[PDB]
Every structure is written in C-alpha cells, then in structure tokens.
C-alpha cells in the first residue's frame, strides 16, 4: 500500500508478513471457495501492483489456478492496450506517461512509477484495475473448482430451510450465471429443489414471494 | 477511522486489510447469527461512512441480505431527511453545513466533509448514526436467518441446563421481540420448555426466581 | 378471408364449416397444448377480425381460457389506442380512417371497413395484428395449462434420448421463458436431467456440443 | 400455388387453411419420421417460395430442426449463387432476370416475380428447387431424429417377418446411406438380423434371393 512519511510524501509500504500469511491461509485452506474472492478484496485493500504480484506468488504454487490467472491477466492487458493506444507526440512535463498492459500489472514497471500513477488529482487507479483483473481470474478459478452444479443443490429431508438457502446462494455465487439467469434460478429453482414440506409451503406462498417471506414461512419446518 | 498527524490535524485512516478480512470472515462464516452484530460493532469502532460502505461491500455478495440492508438504509435516510429539513438562509462561515441522508451514508459526500463533521466540539456523529442504521439492517437480517423459533427451543432430556439457557437467550436475541414480550418469555417460556427434572425443580422454585437461582438449582441436574 | 369476385373486387369469404370444425376439434381435443398455437396460425391464415371472433366463439365455452383471451385482447387494444392516438383534423377523401382498438378486433367495426383496411397498397394488416393478440392470449393459456415444469422433465431409465429431447423442447415451448433463459436451459438442463448413461455420454461430449451431435452420440443408448 | 383467372392470367393462390393445418399436424405429431418427407412433397405440390416459407413457419417452432433447415437452405443458396453467376450486360426486354439465392427462397423476392419465373415456356422451376432444398433439410432432420440404428433393427422372436422388413426398410430410409451401402444392407443385414427360424429359412434360400421370395418363404413363420 501507500502511506505518507513525515515529509508529506507518498511512499510505498510493503504488505505486512501476517497479511501475506492470512492470504496464504486463504489460498491453501479454502479450496477456492467463493468466499476467497471477498477476502482477497479485503486483504489487498489499497495495494500496489507489486504487492498484488507478491500475493499472486502464493497462487503460483497451484499450477492450474496460476495458469488460469496468468491467461486472464494477459487477456485483460491485451484488451487494455487495445483500448488505450500509445499516443505519438509531445508529453507535458507535469503530466506522467500512460502505463502499458505490462506496466499496470507490474511486470516491467517500477515502484516509483506506480506510486506516482496511483497518487494523483484526479487519481488513475492502476492497483484497482489490476485487482479487478485478479478478481476476474479468481472468479474463473472458483467456477472451475465448484464441486456441485446449482441444479444439484437440493434441500435434505431434515435440512433446515436456511441452510438450504445458504448452500443454494453459495453455489449460485460460485457459478456466476447471467443476471437474468440468476434471477430465474432464485425465483424458480430454489422452490423446485426444496424438500416436500417446504416445497408445499412455498407453492402455497405463490410466485413473486420475497426471500424474507419464504424464510419466514419455512422457519421451523 | 480518524487519526492525528504530526501537525495535529484530523486525517482519515483506511481500515487495515486484516480488519476487513476479519469482517469478511464474520460475514461469510457465521451465517448471520446474532453474534455478527456485536462483532461488527467492535470491528467498525470509530469508523467513517466510507469505511462503513467498504465493510458493506462484503455483504453485497449476499444479495438478499444486501437488499435488506439497502432498504433499511434508504428508509433511515428518508426519515433523517424528514426530521432534518434543509434550512433556507445564511450559513455561518465557521459552521459547516448539514449533511443530507445521501451524505451521512457516504453515497455522495467526500472524505474531508465526513472528517470535518465527525471531529467537532461538540461533535455530530455521522459515522455512529450510519453504524446504527447498519445495525438495524443487520438485526433484520439476523431475524430473517434465524433457524428456530423461541417456542421451539426445548431442553434436551440429557442437555445441561446452562446450555439450554444459552440456546434460549441466543434465540431470544435473534428474534428481537418487544421488551415486555421478552420479559414474559424469559419468565415463563424458559421454565415451560425445560426438561422434566429441571421443570419440576424450577416449578418448586416458584415464580419470580432470578436466573442465577434457577441456574444454581439446576446446575448438575 | 378475402377473395376476388368476377368484377375484380375484394369480397369477404366466410370460413368454411370444416375449417371451423377443425378449429373446434383443436380446442376441444388438445387441452391447450403448445401445438394448438401453430395450428391456429394455420387455420386462421389470411382471416378477417370477424372470422377471428367466430373462431374465438369456440374458446368461449372454456370460461377461464376465454376470460384470459379477453383480458389479453383488451390490454392489447388499450396499448394500441395509446400508441395510435386519434388525430384531429381533415382526412383525405382517398384515404380511409384509422380503426380503433375496438374496431381492429371487430367488436364494433363492419365487414366492409375491415375489407378495405386489409386490402391496400401498402396494406395495413388488421387481421394479422388481431391474430398476433390472439396468439399472445393462446400462449398465456398454454403456459397456464402446462402440466409439468421444465425442471421436472427427466429422461426415463429406458426412455430413448430422442423422446426425452422432444418432451423437453415441448415443455420449453409451453413455458415460454426468456431467450437467454431458454438458451441456458437447452445448454445445461437437458444434459442435467438425462438418464445416467446418456448423461455420462453427454458429459464426455463436453460443453457447447450441438443438439445434432448430442442426439447422434446417444442414438441407441 | 398458381391458378388461372377468368382473363387467362397466372395468379398466385394462397395455401388453404386446412392444407396448412395438415402440414402442422404432420410436423407436430410425427416426430420427424421418414414419412414426413413424402407427405410434405404431397402437401407442397406446385407451391411458390412464399408458400414454402409459410409452411416452414410451422417448423420454426422446433428450434433445432428450424436451424438445421436454415443452414441447409443457406448452403444450397450459396451453391446456387456460385453455380449461377450474375451476368453483366444487356438484358432482353422479353426475358426476365435471373433470381438470386435469396430470391428463389423468397426471402427478398416478391410474389409477381416468382409467378412470372415459374410460368414460362420453357419454365424455370424456382418452387421445385426450393422444395428440393427443403427436402434435403428434412432428410437431415429425419436422420438426426432417427431413434435406432439399422444395425439395431432385429426381428423379434415372435415378430412376423413382414413387420421386421417394414421396420428395417423404414430405418434404412431414415438413415439415408450410400446406394451401394444400402444395397449391401438390404442383401446382408436383413438376413443377419432375422430371428432364428426365418434366418435358417433365408440362409437355405441362398444369396441373391429377391425380397418377394424372402417374404414368401417366411410368410407364416
Ligand atoms: O479475525 P481475527 O479475530 O482478527 O483473528 C486473528 C487471526 O486468527 P485466525 O484467522 O486464526 O482466527 C490471525 O491469524 P493470521 O491469519 O493473521 O495468522 C491471528 O494471528 P496469529 O497468526 O499471530 O495467530 C490473530 O491472533 P492474535 O490475537 O494472537 O494476534 C487473530 O486475532 P484474535 O486473536 O483477536 O481473534
Ligand atoms: O385423408 P382423408 O381421408 O381425406 O382425411 C381427412 C383428414 O382427416 P384425418 O387426417 O384426421 O384423417 C382431414 O384432416 P385435416 O388434417 O385436413 O384437418 C379432415 O378434415 P378436418 O380437419 O375438417 O377434420 C377430413 O375430415 P372431413 O371429412 O370432416 O372433411 C378427412 O376426410 P375424410 O373424413 O373424408 O376421411
């Protein structure tokens, strides 16, 4: 991340060892469950591309996931280069140059360049964009590692309704379908795959019932 | 949160990555149990509205809970605007303006505005009010996610009395009934739903026995 | 329909009794299956609004379906009136007036008016629009009368794959989901609900396999 | 189709509603069995491309079959354009222009153009060629929808020989193998897959026995 020294200057600060160890635990203990994605977003808060690559080195041990991440990052960098062509001409002395795809990801750039790019009025977030590419890669990995399809999430005969809803929504978050498809799933498949008692109650509740009403009517069933 | 620099000026400090990761773990691992509410109150201690929105982004993955939170926040903001009309007239140069409902929640305000609003003599807490709205939303979510009714909390035939009391009071905290209703529950339903031996002992103890006496008389039963 | 007399003039021709009897058989024998919709479209080919109302009189015996049709027609007529306001001013002697919502459906118009409206260069199809409203109503009825959800269409242990595909697509046509949802269904649910042998083969076939390849690989299984 | 008016002029006549309904019944009730192909050829006798598209609208409900038909028609139109290049130069006033691939199928042409093209001395059949393309598409669909391979057509232990022959030849018509392969099938596989008594009789009959002799020798077996 970026901090301020006693002179009021922006200086890069390395990720603390225990934050890196928390990220390592997340990678090595959660088997790329969907919750890995928010946690990363919390653990890389306000990070620099060098810090993001340091965090990615933990994923580098997982060869398949690391390869998927590298493919996603390369594709995003190519798209960024395509959408941000290198302008030919004079550059203002007070304005910094435009980083390339290999520079925003920190493969070739230096620390001072990223510090200057991130701290500006208005700021151009390179760390945030690299983080978004990382999150895209992580979402792909979570989809790859999902053990069950949403069509296979069925409420158990004695399973409480809240646990079934939690499993259903966790699987839905893992699968990352289209928004309309997700809405159709939450409206139809959740009722369809419930156990007979909750299914009867939800059918009696009618279409268009909110999730709160559904969980209320099935609370102790 | 807000800290003081070497110049004695109030400056916003971002939430540390491990605090955000602790909040992420709370959201993603505790299934909106009642204890999520104190923990949030601990983890957002002295926070700014921007920090509170950063913490809410973790809840944003949970679509139903996020929608309930957004509804509660919008209702609270509308009530705040209704109870705090925008005064038309001159404003003192030394007195800051009054934030609106979309400004206290940090949807439209800036960091410097919130820093100035929170640090004053006397202070007007915007972060605390936003936190209270968040806690209202979280209480609604905990009520929604409660798996069992208080009427269904019954002591097991071999369950120790202290565990039954703990489950009963946890469910009572989840349900959030009216204060008189809660008092009636703790006075009558706790005795009513106990197992036969503890029920006999508590009936012999008589009405109006304190919880300490009840747990004493049933300690090893 | 409309025919030409020996004088070269457009004259309305009534629907033949056996065409009406075919429509009656479709209504009374097919229980509003999806195939009722193409057949109607074939049987009302080039029809006038009076003819369409004559055909609807067969549906009028089915009270619920007739009420749904009347609701759909009234809604479509109201939308047509909203989108086609009655212009105030002179009307060309050679140009016919604009029919209203109650006039295109033939509730108040006469035969000569519809004959003149339909036969023009360029023609303004009133019979076709009324037919489209009828088809909307019929689609609603078919959705209402569908006996099974698409989620409940599962291949039998000894059922041939082509029959399962036919049932699946018939149910999909009955349900009339959104196009993206329909694509998701045909891509995922068809494989998901197949019997174990065909399911194994289709999983080996991989995602993105065309329906022809799927039916080929499962032909005799 | 095309009829003659009282003035001796060729005028297009629309397909009667009951012919269209017969075609709809064929499409929706026969599951693309091989007999759908002769029936279509009977029902579209002397039809125009606009009429053929009207008949295809019934198939348009069957999404996979409609897509296969559209692919076949587009391929045939491309081949027709390749084999019939647009000549650059003068055109005789008494000779009509050459329709393109999108014009013979009636996607862009008009009714009068097709009427003039079809009625000529000598006539250039555009409806017949479009019908042949439709029949190619339908043959592809029938091959796709065939439930059993010809190798899986085996005479039942008590099945009469004529029924086995009928099933065998129906499957052979569905599969549409090469002519030499079809001859090999009818000569060898029919005897190979018969039940033991008929198989013994046919083996005694010898190679090169005609189908009439085979059905005679196995009539009551
Ligand atoms: O979410 P928190 O409540 O802040 O939990 C943390 C977390 O512990 P867990 O993830 O095991 O719950 C830290 O683990 P790290 O991933 O950073 O390693 C751990 O730090 P240690 O690594 O040093 O164990 C720390 O424990 P400590 O209090 O000893 O600093 C502990 O905080 P709490 O103990 O306050 O829960
Ligand atoms: O092959 P055909 O003997 O001429 O059969 C037709 C055919 O009936 P089926 O296909 O049910 O055997 C017609 O059905 P369409 O497909 O044209 O609808 C039907 O006409 P309807 O639709 O009006 O039932 C007509 O019956 P009708 O005699 O009432 O005209 C009937 O002819 P036959 O009754 O002479 O068999």
Numbering used by the authors:
A (entry chain A), B (entry chain A), C (entry chain A), D (entry chain A): 1 to 221
Paper text:
Along the body of the cone, the CA subunits are assembled on a hexagonal lattice, with the CA amino-terminal domain (NTD) making hexameric rings that are linked together by the carboxy-terminal domain (CTD). Twelve CA pentamers occupy sharp points of curvature—termed declinations—exactly 12 of which are required for the capsid to completely close. Here, we identify a Thr-Val-Gly-Gly motif that modulates CA hexamer/pentamer switching by folding into a 310 helix in the pentamer and random coil in the hexamer.
Next, we surmised that the Met66 gate must constitute part of the activation barrier for coil-to-helix switching. Thus, a constitutively open gate (M66A) should also favor pentamers, and indeed the CA-M66A mutant also assembled into T = 1 particles, as did the CA-G60A G61P M66A triple mutant. We solved the cryo-EM structures of these T = 1 capsids to 2.2 Å (CA-G60A G61P), 3.1 Å (CA-M66A), and 2.4 Å (CA-G60A G61P M66A). These confirmed that the mutant pentamers have the same structure as the WT pentamer, with the switch in the 310 helix configuration and the gate in the open configuration. Interestingly, the CA-M66A mutant also failed to assemble in three independent experiments, although the mutation does not directly modify the TVGG switch. This result argues against a simple model wherein the TVGG motif fluctuates between the two states pre-assembly and then gets locked in upon assembly. We speculate that the random coil configuration may be analogous to a restrained spring that is poised to refold but is prevented from doing so by the closed Met66 gate. In accordance with our prediction, the CA-M66A, CA-G60A G61P and CA-G60A G61P M66A T = 1 particles were not stabilized by the FG peptide.
